[PDB]
């Protein structure tokens, strides 16, 4: 088995969790829960949401 990474949040998607999305340009996005899948569909930038891996990396939190 393989554990995946959530596109919006960076969390780990163990088998059978979340949903997968395939937009017109063949790019694949994996989400762990409906919370993240909705924040993606609202065209919301991950680097602003406080609880995400991209936001913490950008703000240098967790060193």
């Amino acid at each position: 088995m393989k554990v995946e990474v959530d596109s919006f949040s960076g969390a780990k998607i163990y088998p059978g969790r979340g949903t997968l999305f395939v937009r017109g340009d063949s790019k694949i996005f994996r989400f762990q829960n409906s919370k993240s899948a909705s924040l993606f569909k609202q065209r919301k930038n991950p680097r602003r949401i406080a609880w995400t891996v991209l936001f913490r990396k950008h703000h240098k939190k967790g060193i």
Partner: protein
Amino acid sequence: SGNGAQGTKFRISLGLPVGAIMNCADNSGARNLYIIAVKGSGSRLNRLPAASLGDMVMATVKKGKPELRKKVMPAIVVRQAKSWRRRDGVFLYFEDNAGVIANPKGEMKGSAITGPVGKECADLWPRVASNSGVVV
């Protein structure tokens, strides 16, 4: 299903009942397809036939080139927006409904598909996997 089917298909959620308009994904000259039936459906007192990814449907061309309009002609569903579960536990969905034209035994009217194509349609139709670019 059809003469050109390569085998069997595991069930996936129906999402294109009769009356649904789904994009045309080939270069045959059509802009969209209009489902009027689905091959391989059953009967119930008020249950509408519904097609899924891999089904051969009978369809008409509503907006498209004049020669292709005003006549019933088959098709194959290449994408769908309803989310379905694979036996490997992953729910997924495309962002649009699409399909391509075909003759009764699964040969495309055209020579190129634009966009991703579900692996369940490719494995079931030898003449769709040939022209597919990216399969998910």
